[PDB]
Amino acid sequence: RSCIDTIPKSRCTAFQCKHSMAYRLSFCRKTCGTC
């Protein structure tokens, strides 16, 4: 189970991490903690 972020965490900030899953889905996989 290997996933990698491919976004600026900046985008998956606390404000979009639990708001913009569009990043926190599989863009900020680890970065947020969703993969």
Q: What is the DSSP string of the chain?
A: ------S-TTTTSHHHHTT-HHHHTTTSIIIII--
Contact status, residue 7 vs residue 30, Cβ threshold 8 Å: no
Nearest-angstrom CA–CA distance, 3 and 29? 6
Could you tell me the two tokens for 26? 């599989």
One-letter amino acid for residue 14 of the chain = A
Contact status, residue 14 vs residue 8, Cβ threshold 8 Å: no
One-letter amino acid for residue 11 of the chain = R
What does the DSSP 8-state code read for residue 31? I
Could you tell me the two tokens for 34? 């969703």
Alpha-helical (H) ranges within 1-35 are 14-17, 21-24
Could you tell me the two tokens for 29? 């996989």
Method: NMR
Question: Rounded to 5 degrees, what are φ and ψ at 23?
Answer: -115, -60
One-letter amino acid for residue 30 of the chain = K
